[PDB]
Amino acid sequence: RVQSGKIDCGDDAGWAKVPSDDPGRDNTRELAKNITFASPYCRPPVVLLSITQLDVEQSQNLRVIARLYSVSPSGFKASCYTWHNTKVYSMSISWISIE
Amino acid sequence: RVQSGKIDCGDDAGWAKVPSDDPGRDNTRELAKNITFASPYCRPPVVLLSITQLDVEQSQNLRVIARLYSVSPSGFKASCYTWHNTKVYSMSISWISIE
Amino acid sequence: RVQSGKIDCGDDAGWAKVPSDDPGRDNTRELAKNITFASPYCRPPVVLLSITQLDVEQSQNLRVIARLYSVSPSGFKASCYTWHNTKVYSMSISWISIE
Amino acid sequence: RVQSGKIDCGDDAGWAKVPSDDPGRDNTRELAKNITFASPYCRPPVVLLSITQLDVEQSQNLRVIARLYSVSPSGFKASCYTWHNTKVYSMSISWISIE
Amino acid sequence: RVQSGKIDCGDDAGWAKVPSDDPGRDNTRELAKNITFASPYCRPPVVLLSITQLDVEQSQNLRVIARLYSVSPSGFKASCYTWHNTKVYSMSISWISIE
Amino acid sequence: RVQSGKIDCGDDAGWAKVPSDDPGRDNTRELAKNITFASPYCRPPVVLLSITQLDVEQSQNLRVIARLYSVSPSGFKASCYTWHNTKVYSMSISWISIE
Numbered sequence: 025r026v027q028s029g030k031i032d033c034g035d036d037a038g039w040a041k042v043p044s045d046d047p048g049r050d051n052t053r054e055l056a057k058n059i060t061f062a063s064p065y066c067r068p069p070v071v072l073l074s075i076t077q078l079d080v081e082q083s084q085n086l087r088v089i090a091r092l093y094s095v096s097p098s099g100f101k102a103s104c105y106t107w108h109n110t111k112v113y114s115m116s117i118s119w120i121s122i123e
Numbered sequence: 124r125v126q127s128g129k130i131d132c133g134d135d136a137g138w139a140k141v142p143s144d145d146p147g148r149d150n151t152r153e154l155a156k157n158i159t160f161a162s163p164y165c166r167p168p169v170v171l172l173s174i175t176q177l178d179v180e181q182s183q184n185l186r187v188i189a190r191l192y193s194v195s196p197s198g199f200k201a202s203c204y205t206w207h208n209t210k211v212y213s214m215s216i217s218w219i220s221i222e
Numbered sequence: 223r224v225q226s227g228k229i230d231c232g233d234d235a236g237w238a239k240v241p242s243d244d245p246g247r248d249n250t251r252e253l254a255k256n257i258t259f260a261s262p263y264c265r266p267p268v269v270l271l272s273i274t275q276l277d278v279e280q281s282q283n284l285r286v287i288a289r290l291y292s293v294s295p296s297g298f299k300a301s302c303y304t305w306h307n308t309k310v311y312s313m314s315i316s317w318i319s320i321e
Numbered sequence: 322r323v324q325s326g327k328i329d330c331g332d333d334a335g336w337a338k339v340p341s342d343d344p345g346r347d348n349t350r351e352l353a354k355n356i357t358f359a360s361p362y363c364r365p366p367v368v369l370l371s372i373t374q375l376d377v378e379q380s381q382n383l384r385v386i387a388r389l390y391s392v393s394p395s396g397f398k399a400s401c402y403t404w405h406n407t408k409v410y411s412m413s414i415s416w417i418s419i420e
Numbered sequence: 421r422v423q424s425g426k427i428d429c430g431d432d433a434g435w436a437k438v439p440s441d442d443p444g445r446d447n448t449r450e451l452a453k454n455i456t457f458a459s460p461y462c463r464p465p466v467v468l469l470s471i472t473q474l475d476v477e478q479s480q481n482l483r484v485i486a487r488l489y490s491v492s493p494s495g496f497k498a499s500c501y502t503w504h505n506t507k508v509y510s511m512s513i514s515w516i517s518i519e
Numbered sequence: 520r521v522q523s524g525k526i527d528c529g530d531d532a533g534w535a536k537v538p539s540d541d542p543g544r545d546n547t548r549e550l551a552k553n554i555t556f557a558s559p560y561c562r563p564p565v566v567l568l569s570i571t572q573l574d575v576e577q578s579q580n581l582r583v584i585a586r587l588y589s590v591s592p593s594g595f596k597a598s599c600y601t602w603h604n605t606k607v608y609s610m611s612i613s614w615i616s617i618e
């Protein structure tokens with residue numbers, strides 16, 4: 025069984041600063057969301073993320089990650105992530121889960 | 124059952140102007156395609172879109188959406204979508220459908 | 223049955239020049255990877271690729287393709303691909319395979 | 322998708338005489354039932370029948386068939402079947418359908 | 421997901437007398453077994469029973485039922501059942517469960 | 520994936536005597552068939568057998584087994600089996616295989 029949805033991260037003025045896990049990256053920032061499946065699994069499904077909306081400032085490099093932090097039978101944690109001097113005006117992630 | 128394919132939207136000189144559904148966005152433009160499954164379903168499958176080709180002008184912001192408008196047992200409507208002064212030289216969407 | 227993973231292509235200083243399959247594109251370059259499933263299929267699965275990390279130079283156009291070259295019951299060939307004067311500092315592809 | 326149920330044919334005093342399709346068999350008799358799935362398929366499912374109740378007269382040979390006549394996406398035709406001088410006091414068929 | 425196994429009820433000298441649920445039947449007797457799946461489901465699977473071994477006394481009528489009492493995500497209750505003056509020397513039930 | 524079919528064992532005058540695997544049973548006889556799937560699996564499917572035709576002599580006890588000897592990705596070995604002084608005029612086994 026298969027479910028899908030979309031996460032809208034919005035403008036990065038709304039994202040949280042987080043510690044960087046890469047010493048070559050600073051000003052690491054993200055919008056993390058815990059998603060609850062509209063039907064829990066008995067064991068974690070496979071999840072794939074896709075970036076289906078981007079609005080990014082041209083005067084600075086494009087730096088984006090769609091992160092999948094963890095997955096459980098009832099949902100998952102994912103984030104829109106950026107760093108350094110990138111400005112993201114909007115980013116959305118589509119996802120699918122397959123049992 | 125699982126199907127996949129790719130939609131090539133090409134250069135936005137070929138896209139249609141459409142009414143904007145967001146008053147903060149103007150010059151909204153898209154390449155819409157109705158895809159017919161190579162095997163109809165009995166009820167709509169789950170569809171996920173992925174942007175697997177982008178060629179975008181660096182002097183203006185990157186603004187892209189891969190839209191899924193609707194899905195039926197025999198196919199779906201999807202578009203490459205941009206707005207304002209972005210120039211897209213090519214954009215392609217890969218898709219998968221899962222019954 | 224469903225498998226997934228991620229391919230990290232890294233900085234394009236590490237990519238290979240390849241012959242261009244499009245006369246309108248030069249300096250065609252890619253990082254190709256042959257992935258071996260953590261469980262072989264009896265006939266090729268359906269595979270979808272998603273670009274889940276991009277770090278690209280703003281002073282030149284964004285030009286990226288996530289290519290799926292071929293798929294077999296035991297794995298597939300995919301690449302991160304760019305051309306002309308684009309500079310990619312990092313690119314990663316997430317994939318899912320469904321029997 | 323998987324469905325199941327049971328057909329109770331009861332005492333053969335209630336069965337219909339039918340033409341014999343085997344010249345070595347006479348007094349061919351059956352209880353035929355058309356079953357409608359509690360959820361139609363798009364193409365015929367695979368159906369298996371199992372005889373899960375028998376009450377048969379010991380003074381004559383045991384002669385029973387559980388017949389599957391035909392199967393469609395929305396149901397199937399099955400019968401309890403006997404012949405010659407057998408007496409069946411009750412017979413029930415359990416079935417399963419798998420898409 | 422699909423599991424199967426077999427229940428051997430043996431000689432009815434080993435079966436339990438049970439109250440009859442049919443006033444037309446007396447001396448109702450059965451061998452009931454609670455089966456635990458070799459892998460629990462999240463919600464009850466569909467189960468089908470099949471009588472795959474019978475050794476029955478010819479001087480009395482053949483009277484047998486393979487009963488499915490109940491089914492849960494982790495197993496099911498089934499019995500070999502007879503009544504009146506039938507003698508069963510052995511009876512075995514094969515089963516399959518499909519999620 | 521799901522396949523089914525039927526094995527017709529016919530009159531036991533055609534069955535082979537086999538060594539008995541039970542010292543309490545003599546004159547052990549069977550009709551063994553190796554079935555080849557109309558589509559090989561990559562690993563053995565689950566198989567269930569059902570006795571869907573019986574014609575047995577009333578003057579001797581009913582003694583029948585539907586045996587599943589072994590199963591492989593491309594087929595299985597099954598038999599109609601009887602013993603002692605039982606006479607089987609016809610026996611047929613229906614089967615289903617589920618990947």
Ligand SMILES: CC(=O)N[C@@H]1[C@@H](O)[C@@H](O)[C@@H](CO)O[C@@H]1O
Nearest residue numbers: 048049050085087107108277311
């Ligand atoms: C300190 C920091 O975040 N540095 C970043 C580096 O991580 C990389 O993204 C580069 C190319 O875009 O831009 C900056 O140098």
Ligand SMILES: CC(=O)N[C@@H]1[C@@H](O)[C@@H](O)[C@@H](CO)O[C@@H]1O
Nearest residue numbers: 079113147148149184186206207
């Ligand atoms: C009117 C219009 O389309 N305005 C756009 C806005 O929607 C947003 O995309 C922004 C950042 O890229 O660029 C412009 O201001």
Ligand SMILES: CC(=O)N[C@@H]1[C@@H](O)[C@@H](O)[C@@H](CO)O[C@@H]1O
Nearest residue numbers: 178212246247248283285305306
């Ligand atoms: C020769 C070559 O690669 N030319 C490229 C062309 O293929 C297209 O990518 C364009 C817009 O970004 O940029 C350059 O003109």
Ligand SMILES: CC(=O)N[C@@H]1[C@@H](O)[C@@H](O)[C@@H](CO)O[C@@H]1O
Nearest residue numbers: 345346347382384404405574608
């Ligand atoms: C004419 C007729 O039905 N004949 C039947 C034959 O078909 C077979 O069932 C046999 C053994 O039970 O009993 C009778 O001879």
Ligand SMILES: CC(=O)N[C@@H]1[C@@H](O)[C@@H](O)[C@@H](CO)O[C@@H]1O
Nearest residue numbers: 376410444445446481483503504
């Ligand atoms: C009281 C009782 O169990 N009566 C049984 C009846 O239920 C039915 O099985 C019949 C034919 O075999 O044999 C007997 O009459």
Ligand SMILES: CC(=O)N[C@@H]1[C@@H](O)[C@@H](O)[C@@H](CO)O[C@@H]1O
Nearest residue numbers: 475509543544545580582602603
């Ligand atoms: C030696 C032999 O096969 N003996 C059989 C025994 O196995 C059992 O089937 C019994 C009741 O039907 O009938 C005979 O005694």
Ligand SMILES: *[C@@H]1O[C@H](CO)[C@@H](O)[C@H](O)[C@H]1NC(C)=O
Nearest residue numbers: 057058094095096099100101
């Ligand atoms: C969100 O749920 C995930 C489980 O997938 C857990 O790892 C994470 O820490 C949770 N955080 C919050 C604040 O809900």
Ligand SMILES: *[C@@H]1O[C@H](CO)[C@@H](O)[C@H](O)[C@H]1NC(C)=O
Nearest residue numbers: 156157193194195198199200
């Ligand atoms: C395309 O098909 C979709 C159904 O998925 C429908 O909603 C849409 O309006 C159709 N448009 C055209 C012109 O085919």
Ligand SMILES: *[C@@H]1O[C@H](CO)[C@@H](O)[C@H](O)[C@H]1NC(C)=O
Nearest residue numbers: 255256292293294297298299
């Ligand atoms: C990688 O494996 C693929 C099969 O999917 C094959 O087409 C390709 O040429 C192989 N190349 C290398 C050097 O392994």
Ligand SMILES: *[C@@H]1O[C@H](CO)[C@@H](O)[C@H](O)[C@H]1NC(C)=O
Nearest residue numbers: 354355391392393396397398
């Ligand atoms: C019952 O439905 C079946 C289709 O599976 C058809 O073949 C059969 O003749 C029907 N008969 C009656 C009277 O409904």
Ligand SMILES: *[C@@H]1O[C@H](CO)[C@@H](O)[C@H](O)[C@H]1NC(C)=O
Nearest residue numbers: 453454490491492495496497
């Ligand atoms: C066996 O388990 C079933 C559940 O499927 C329950 O209904 C039944 O009463 C149990 N009985 C015993 C004694 O275990």
Ligand SMILES: *[C@@H]1O[C@H](CO)[C@@H](O)[C@H](O)[C@H]1NC(C)=O
Nearest residue numbers: 552553589590591594595596
């Ligand atoms: C039939 O094939 C089975 C494999 O399922 C094997 O065990 C058996 O011995 C074979 N016998 C014959 C003579 O084909």
Ligand SMILES: [Zn+2]
Nearest residue numbers: 084108109110
């Ligand atoms: Zn800097």
Ligand SMILES: [Zn+2]
Nearest residue numbers: 183207208209
């Ligand atoms: Zn502007």
Ligand SMILES: [Zn+2]
Nearest residue numbers: 282306307308
């Ligand atoms: Zn140039």
Ligand SMILES: [Zn+2]
Nearest residue numbers: 381405406407
């Ligand atoms: Zn006769």
